[PDB]
Amino acid sequence: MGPFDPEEMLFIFTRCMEDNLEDGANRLPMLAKWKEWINEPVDSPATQCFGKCVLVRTGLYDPVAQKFDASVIQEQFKAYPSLGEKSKVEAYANAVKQLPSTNNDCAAVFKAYDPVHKAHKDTSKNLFHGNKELTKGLYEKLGKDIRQKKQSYFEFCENKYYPAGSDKRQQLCQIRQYTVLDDALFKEHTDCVMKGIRYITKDNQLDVEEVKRDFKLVNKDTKALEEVLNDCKSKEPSNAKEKSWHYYKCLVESSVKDDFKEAFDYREVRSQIYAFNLPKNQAYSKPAVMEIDGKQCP
Length: 298
Ligand SMILES: CCCCC/C=C\C\C=C/C=C/C=C/C[C@@H](O)CCCC(=O)O
Ligand SMILES: [Cl-]
Prior knowledge:
By secondary structure, this protein is an all-alpha fold. The protein folds into two domains: 1-147, Orthogonal Bundle (Recoverin, domain 1); 148-298, Pheromone/general odorant binding protein domain (Recoverin, domain 1, Orthogonal Bundle). 54% of the residues lie in helices and 3% in strands. The protein is built from 15 helices and four strands. It has helices spanning 6-20, 27-34, 45-58, 71-79, 86-97, 106-119, 121-127, 132-142, 153-161, 172-175, 184-196, 208-217, 223-233, 243-252, 257-271, and strands spanning 61-62, 67-68, 291-292, 295-296. The strands form two sheets. The protein has a two-stranded antiparallel ribbon. The chain has a two-stranded antiparallel ribbon with strand order 3-4. α11 crosses α14 (243-252). 31% of the residues are buried. The structure holds (5S,7E,9E,11Z,14Z)-5-hydroxyicosa-7,9,11,14-tetraenoic acid and chloride ion. Chloride ion (CL) is lined by residues 149-150, 273-274.
């Protein structure tokens, strides 16, 4: 869960928008409002479910407890003291703490939170990487250590572990062709990628629904995928930091390898622009069937 860096928030915001924007006439108007932290129209199921989505993904609404949880606010402020004034952060947390228990449906959650949203908008916006001026400064500070806006997540990880100008860079020739290397560096790199596309959670758990989501987006059935993942899970290593590499290796070597490569390739494309599908859903077309930094691969 929390605290969340700017990329983690951008992932949450864009996924929740992608999953909840209407199709059709209201899509761009809605997007225009939500992008500016205007949770309107309030009577629209799309807006209500978008709001609940963000609240659930951040942990501000806990659908198991059917309660709001101000803890993430305190965790967020602890991580980013520059993004809040203590008294205003406390006021916001207190507003959340004092919300009643609330049923786990979009309308109820949205209705309950909306008064807090409006009364604490700038506090919440600033704290949760919604302020373009503040976030720009953070991205600049973090530089190569975080995935930047409009940057392929795969490129981010490659640049960290196989940096240009190093003797390791050449290994991308094989890595990009789904060669599964065995060394500690590759296991770490693969952890970077698998966590970056959310196939593996922050606490090293397989997220089967995320993998399935990417198969559906390339028109592939998910039953055989689930069966393969079930088999892979039965052979999970005890060491949590090898779990990303385990599942990557297992998938690449499995009876769904070609569908997996297709899904993973398209995910890399979409990872380049988190808002990929926001202005309108894009239809997938399989790219037609090597160089690294313009240099030809052996
Ligand atoms: C976690 C507090 C919010 C819960 C209330 C529900 C939804 C938030 C409302 C709108 C979210 C809009 C997200 C817009 C993204 C935008 O602010 C990111 C800009 C920062 C950047 O460009 O780097
Ligand atoms: Cl982006």
